[PDB]
Amino acid sequence: KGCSLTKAQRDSIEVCLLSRPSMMQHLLRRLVFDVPLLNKMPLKLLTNHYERCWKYYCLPGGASEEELHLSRKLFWGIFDALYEQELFKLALPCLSAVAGALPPNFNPQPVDTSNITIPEKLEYFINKYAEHSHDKWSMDKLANGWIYGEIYSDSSKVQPLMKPYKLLSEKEKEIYRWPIKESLKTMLAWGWRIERTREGDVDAAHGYSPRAIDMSNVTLSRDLHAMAEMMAENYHNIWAKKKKLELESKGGGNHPLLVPYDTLTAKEKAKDREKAQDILKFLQINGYAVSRGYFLSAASRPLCSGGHASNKEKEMVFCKLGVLVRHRISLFGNDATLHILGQTLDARTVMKTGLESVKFLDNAAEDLEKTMENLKQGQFTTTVALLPMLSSLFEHIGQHQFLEDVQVSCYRILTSLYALGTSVERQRSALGECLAAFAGAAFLETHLDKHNIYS
Amino acid sequence: LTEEQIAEFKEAFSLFDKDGDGTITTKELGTVMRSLGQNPTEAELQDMINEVNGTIDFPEFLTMMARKMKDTDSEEEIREAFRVFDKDGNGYISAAELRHVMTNLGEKLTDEEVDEMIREADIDGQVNYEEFVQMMTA
């Protein structure tokens, strides 16, 4: 389906460009989830729709800001694998300026559950935790007010399982201890440890009476809730596998709720979060610490500058579009603007001097716009300017032997001089010697550059 | 579709047709187009198969390959009919000479259609014919 897929793509792009950015943030979650497989082409069309949303929300909107920075980092790391790459790269410039405006077939993956045992110092706590979970369960049933009875009737206010803690045997506790044990094993198998800390702690009805510690006021911190969310996502993956192993046991297909995780409602995540935090809230009641056992693009600019140095070392052997992508990202950062910026300037001078004498063709054309954007970045933002002037003189000696590469090197020298003189003259004497060497025999443009960018 | 083109299409079909009823089988579409020298994407091939019991036959095969030919004919002929005029080779036709080259025979209508040209053509005045393509070919 060629035109059918293109019509679906136009429908998605128009329904996103007509819509405010809260739903666009919810869909940008799925765009970041799909961005990891960019390097197929229509997943990159979803990435182009996300680029449209970034170009629309760069002003006011440019929760999910860290998600956008993470998606920028992951798309920059996936785009450096290898037309279509030029399309994603030209989309990446406005997305990079938007991130600088910020800076201004499902397959679940469960784990083995029954191969690592539990130390018994937590089994001294299991005897109270399983008790407390069943007490909170019977307390929630006392919110309805259930009464113990014999015949299992759900209409006569009868629960036949409302028996006390003394009348519970081993295998009558094992039915509720099985998710407890096989959740503690998923916590403890990965290398998570919960050590020692300080000590810790409307009318009723008939049956069992829990004076349970109130689970409606307990809250962890952000990384502890992130660990809880990882455990809840694991629990939902196990439940999704438990349903996938039964929807094909009769002989049919699948249920449409097999989606990526970020496209469900709130209660379906909140139930597994409650099951993950029945442990953690009661650890906070007893006072047991659950342990593990913007500036993001500004930080990623130095790694991108190192990658630009590597691309300047080995780009002119096909990778000219990869060099132009980093040049356009540097242009977008120049439209998005501090010693790390000085390190990026030194790495940009290294990227200029890495292929000095070999100045394939479109990279050399776009390098003039990259140098003008670097001069703009110098107009946007320590004594290495003398040695870089000699490196630029060597680049001019490598670019002045050759069509109008001599005039392009003179325009690049005028770009550097406009960046430096808007806010030592041995290299100026070398420029005068170059003018006296190759003036009288492209050269009038070099004269118009040298008579005005001397300051 | 010409003498030679319809001759070639019938020759290729009847050479790939064996039984003598006018129907080749379903998987012969890519075979007959690559015998004619055409290798598109598979989605277009599947659309052309499902546009045709499971017996791909003569009529709309002729019609679809007519459409595939008239696309390239549209490109080449909208190139050359403006290559007639505009003797410096840029596609920039002036507005007065657009009035001249628009009131051709055949249609020969009044100031309605050339008013439709000049009201929206992009005029700076030199007019490139891509604006005329995107206007007049819907």
From Swiss-Prot, chain B:
GO terms for molecular function: adenylate cyclase activator activity; calcium channel inhibitor activity; calcium channel regulator activity; calcium ion binding; calcium-dependent protein binding; protein kinase binding; protein phosphatase activator activity; protein serine/threonine kinase activator activity. The modification N6-methyllysine is found at K108. The modification Phosphoserine is found at S74, S94. Residues 4-39, 40-71, 73-108, 109-138 form the EF-hand domain. Keywords: Acetylation, Calcium, Cell projection, Cilium, Cytoplasm, Cytoskeleton, Disease variant, Flagellum, Host-virus interaction, Isopeptide bond, Long QT syndrome, Metal-binding, Methylation, Phosphoprotein, Repeat, Ubl conjugation. The modification N6-acetyllysine is found at K18, K87. Ca(2+) 1 binds at D17, D19, D21, T23, E28. Residues 69-138 are annotated as: Necessary and sufficient for interaction with PCP4. Ubiquitination results in a strongly decreased activity. Phosphorylation results in a decreased activity. It holds the Pfam family EF-hand_7. Ca(2+) 2 binds at N53, T55, E60. The modification Phosphothreonine is found at T41, T103. The keyword Chaperone does not apply. Ca(2+) 4 binds at D122, D124, Q126, E131. Calmodulin acts as part of a calcium signal transduction pathway by mediating the control of a large number of enzymes, ion channels, aquaporins and other proteins through calcium-binding. Calcium-binding is required for the activation of calmodulin. Among the enzymes to be stimulated by the calmodulin-calcium complex are a number of protein kinases, such as myosin light-chain kinases and calmodulin-dependent protein kinase type II (CaMK2), and phosphatases. Belongs to the calmodulin family. This protein has four functional calcium-binding sites. It is linked to Ventricular tachycardia, catecholaminergic polymorphic, 4: An arrhythmogenic disorder characterized by stress-induced, bidirectional ventricular tachycardia that may degenerate into cardiac arrest and cause sudden death. Patients present with recurrent syncope, seizures, or sudden death after physical activity or emotional stress. CPVT4 inheritance is autosomal dominant. Long QT syndrome 14: A form of long QT syndrome, a heart disorder characterized by a prolonged QT interval on the ECG and polymorphic ventricular arrhythmias. They cause syncope and sudden death in response to exercise or emotional stress, and can present with a sentinel event of sudden cardiac death in infancy. This is Calmodulin-1. It comes from Homo sapiens. The lineage of its organism: Eukaryota, Metazoa, Chordata, Craniata, Vertebrata.
